Paper text:
Vibrio cholerae contains multiple copies of chemotaxis response regulator (VcCheY1–VcCheY4) whose functions are elusive yet. Autophosphorylated CheA then donates phosphate to the response regulator CheY. Phosphorylated CheY interacts with the flagellar motor protein FliM and influence the direction of flagellar rotation from counter clock wise (CCW) to clock wise (CW). As expected, both VcCheY3 and VcCheY4 possess (β/α)5 fold typical of the response regulators.
VcCheY4 was crystallized in two different states; one is in free state with no ligand attached (VcCheY4free) and another with a sulfate and a Ca2+ ion bound at the active site (VcCheY4sulf). A Ca2+ ion is located at the active site of VcCheY4sulf which coordinates with D9, D52 and main chain carbonyl oxygen of N54 with an average coordination distance of 2.4 Å. A tetrahedral positive electron density was observed in the active-site pocket of VcCheY4sulf during refinement which was interpreted as a sulfate ion because VcCheY4 was crystallized using ammonium sulfate as precipitant. Since VcCheY4sulf was crystallized at pH 4.0, at this pH D52 might be protonated allowing the sulfate ion to come to its close vicinity. T82 and K104, which are well known to stabilize the phosphoryl group in the other reported CheY structures, stabilize the sulfate ion in VcCheY4sulf through hydrogen bonding. A movement of about 2 Å towards the active site occurs for T82 along with the β4α4 loop. Interestingly, in VcCheY4sulf, an additional hydrogen is generated between T82 and K89 (K89 corresponds to Q97 of VcCheY3) which might further contribute to the compactness of α4 in VcCheY4sulf. In VcCheY4sulf part of the β4α4 loop is stabilized and adopts a helical structure effectively extending the length of α4 and overall, the VcCheY4sulf structure seems to be more compact compared to VcCheY4free. The crucial residue at β5 that acquires ‘in’ position upon activation is a Trp (W101) in case of VcCheY4 and in both the structures of VcCheY4 the side chain of W101 acquired ‘in’ position. Considering the compactness of the VcCheY4sulf structure having a shorter β4α4 loop with low B-factors, long α4 helix, movement of T82 and β4α4 loop to stabilize the sulfate ion and additional hydrogen bond between T82 and K89, it can be said that VcCheY4 has a strong tendency to be phosphorylated in the presence of a divalent metal ion and the phosphorylated state is more stable compared to its free state.
Numbering used by the authors: -1, 1 to 119
């Protein structure tokens, strides 16, 4: 009954860090290199929380969140936006798509863990 996390970020390093930090903590973690892969993974497995980088090469975190929120099982699933630069503006966009919270890059393991707990 481990909480399932889907972490989306094109960065291999970020994906490894999040996956490593979270799995070591005790989460079941799947990562996706992009929004399309993330959406495919989200449709076959039931994630309890989704972490999405804001700026990715193809599908942005906002469009990914907008899309995943269309999947009925993710109508209310907590979603955390990951980014190096939050802005009053980005946070508004995050509200129009349904984002739940924000995580600032770079994060140390501790902050990542406490942030997930607040939405879970
Ligand atoms: Ca990125």
């Amino acid at each position: 009954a481990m909480a399932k996390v889907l972490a989306v970020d094109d960065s291999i390093s970020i994906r490894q860090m999040v996956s490593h930090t979270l799995q070591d903590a005790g989460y079941e973690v799947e990562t996706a290199a992009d929004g399309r892969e993330a959406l495919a993974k989200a449709q076959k497995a039931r994630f309890d929380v989704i972490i999405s980088d804001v700026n990715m090469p193809v599908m942005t975190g906002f469009e990914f969140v907008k899309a995943v929120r269309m999947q009925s099982q993710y109508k209310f699933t907590p979603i955390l936006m990951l980014t190096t630069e939050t802005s009053p503006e980005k946070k508004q966009e995050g509200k129009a798509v349904g984002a739940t919270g924000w995580l600032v890059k770079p994060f140390n393991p501790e902050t990542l863990l406490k942030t997930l707990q607040r939405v879970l």
